[PDB]
Amino acid sequence: AEQPYHHGSLRRVLLARAESTLEKDGVDGLSLRQLAREAGPSKHFRDRQALLDALAESGFLRLTAALERAVEEAESHARARFAALAGAYVSFALAHRELLALMYGNKHAPGAASQVVEAGHASMDLTVRIVTEAQAAGDIGPGDASRIALVAFATFHGIATLAAGGMLDGAPVDEVVTAASDTFWRGLAQ
């Protein structure tokens, strides 16, 4: 019935519903007013932009979480970690296509919220640290670890972009990720 003590927080409930609509209908199908009525006067969020910022922040937090798990799952050597991070990134991207578009669009919009910006920088910092550790272990050659990380990001975001766009022409995404990882590793390796 009423059930006054079996309610989730409005913030969490609205964010789960918003993400579901985002993935079905896209960002233009998102309405705070609709989501609030759908969740049966507070909408929690001050306005639509606060909702989008929250989704974007949550997206980065979850992407960072996924990369960290990939590292934990894999062997403790650089070649394995590089391979695991790449595969985890592409899987995330393909499982959360509309959220990922929102994450990147929001993060780089004029006046982007600092908590979104900080969350996005964390995912990248993780990668940069793994590259730096690889250089300290002497597995790869010298160079600016943030440029190395950036080339890796472009590579695997490029693969995810081709896959989402139907431009792999029948090459299984997993095989293209692996070929890109092997070639990258070889191009850096000592």
Side-chain angles (χ1 to χ4, degrees), residues 117-163:
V117 176
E118 285 171 19
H121 291 197
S123 313
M124 179 63 70
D125 286 355
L126 188 284
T127 308
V128 172
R129 143 173 52 277
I130 302 278
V131 170
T132 306
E133 295 177 359
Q135 287 173 312
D139 276 359
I140 60 168
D144 182 346
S146 77
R147 290 301 168 89
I148 293 170
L150 189 56
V151 168
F153 175 43
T155 301
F156 300 99
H157 191 66
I159 295 175
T161 300
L162 293 197

Side-chain angles (χ1 to χ4, degrees), residues 16-170:
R17 279 172 187 270
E19 192 174 338
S20 183
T21 302
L22 216 207
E23 290 300 345
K24 268 206 138 65
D25 299 327
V27 66
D28 301 322
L30 280 185
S31 170
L32 180 50
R33 290 169 283 163
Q34 280 192 295
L35 292 159
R37 326 299 139 172
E38 281 163 12
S42 185
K43 308 177 278 50
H44 173 82
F45 294 100
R46 176 99 50 112
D47 51 34
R48 184 164 192 255
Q49 191 64 49
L51 176 66
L52 303 172
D53 288 352
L55 279 166
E57 193 202 16
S58 175
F60 282 110
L61 288 176
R62 289 186 272 153
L63 171 59
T64 299
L67 299 175
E68 292 168 349
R69 293 193 299 261
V71 170
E72 275 266 55
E73 171 179 278
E75 282 162 354
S76 293
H77 68 91
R79 181 170 197 174
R81 289 179 171 202
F82 281 36
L85 284 169
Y89 179 78
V90 179
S91 295
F92 189 94
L94 299 178
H96 305 279
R97 303 189 195 186
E98 296 293 346
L99 177 72
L100 192 80
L102 175 64
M103 283 161 60
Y104 297 153
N106 178 283
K107 188 183 175 297
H108 304 273
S114 54
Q115 74 276 8
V116 176
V117 176
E118 285 171 19
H121 291 197
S123 313
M124 179 63 70
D125 286 355
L126 188 284
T127 308
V128 172
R129 143 173 52 277
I130 302 278
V131 170
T132 306
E133 295 177 359
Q135 287 173 312
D139 276 359
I140 60 168
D144 182 346
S146 77
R147 290 301 168 89
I148 293 170
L150 189 56
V151 168
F153 175 43
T155 301
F156 300 99
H157 191 66
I159 295 175
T161 300
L162 293 197
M167 286 182 286
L168 294 184
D169 202 12

